[PDB]
Amino acid sequence: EMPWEQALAIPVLAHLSSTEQHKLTQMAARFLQQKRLVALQGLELTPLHQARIAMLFCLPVLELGIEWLDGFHEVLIYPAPFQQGPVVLNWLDIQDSFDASGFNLVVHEVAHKLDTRDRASGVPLIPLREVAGWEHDLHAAMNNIQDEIDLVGESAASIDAYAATDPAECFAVLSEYFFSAPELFAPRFPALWQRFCHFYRQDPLARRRE
Ligand SMILES: [Cl-]
Numbered sequence: 001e002m003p004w005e006q007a008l009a010i011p012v013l014a015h016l017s018s019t020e021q022h023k024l025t026q027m028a029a030r031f032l033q034q035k036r037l038v039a040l041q042g043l044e045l046t047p048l049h050q051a052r053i054a055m056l057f058c059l060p061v062l063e064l065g066i067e068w069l070d071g072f073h074e075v076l077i078y079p080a081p082f083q084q085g086p087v088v089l090n091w092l093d094i095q096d097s098f099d100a101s102g103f104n105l106v107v108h109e110v111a112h113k114l115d116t117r118d119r120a121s122g123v124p125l126i127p128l129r130e131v132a133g134w135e136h137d138l139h140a141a142m143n144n145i146q147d148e149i150d151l152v153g154e155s156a157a158s159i160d161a162y163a164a165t166d167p168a169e170c171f172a173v174l175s176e177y178f179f180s181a182p183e184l185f186a187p188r189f190p191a192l193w194q195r196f197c198h199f200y201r202q203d204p205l206a207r208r209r210e
Pocket residue numbers: 011012013015100179180181182204
């Protein structure tokens with residue numbers, strides 16, 4: 001028996017409703033039926049680690065569906081940092097991804113898969129008529145991040161200068177914020193935040209209230 005109840009007890013998942021926890025648990029169990037977590041270079045992942053990884057994968061698609069993760073069959077997990085291709089992660093960053101700090105490698109990688117589900121362009125599958133307005137708000141968010149970096153420096157800035165430059169990277173980083181530290185996102189980028197709420201069919205800030 002996978003320790004699903006104990007798996008849920010991590011900060012990034014702490015604000016899910018009881019129905020959301022049940023729904024996430026089931027999707028994660030389905031994930032582990034359909035996909036392999038391949039721990040490399042002697043890394044050993046316990047059932048609790050595996051359950052938590054599966055849940056992190058499923059969080060961004062909780063309301064979209066597990067089929068949104070059909071662009072990969074396996075996840076490769078190295079102990080540490082260095083198309084239909086496997087998602088590559090490392091255990092050091094995954095452990096950080098359990099916190100509600102704004103960093104989440106799993107969500108980052110999922111965002112990239114949602115983006116390219118198509119070229120990696122910072123635009124996931126949205127209506128054709130919304131693409132211009134999405135790109136407008138994304139690129140404004142990017143310029144806003146560059147202005148910050150120009151003013152206070154890379155270290156003091158929230159986001160790395162790569163997210164200010166590559167729209168795909170921006171999408172992926174803001175997705176990390178969306179799920180892990182929405183207070184860094186909602187008040188700063190209200191228009192883009194609204195589009196992400198509509199795309200992901202989740203409101204992580206409303207969640208904290210309830
Ligand atoms: Cl949170």
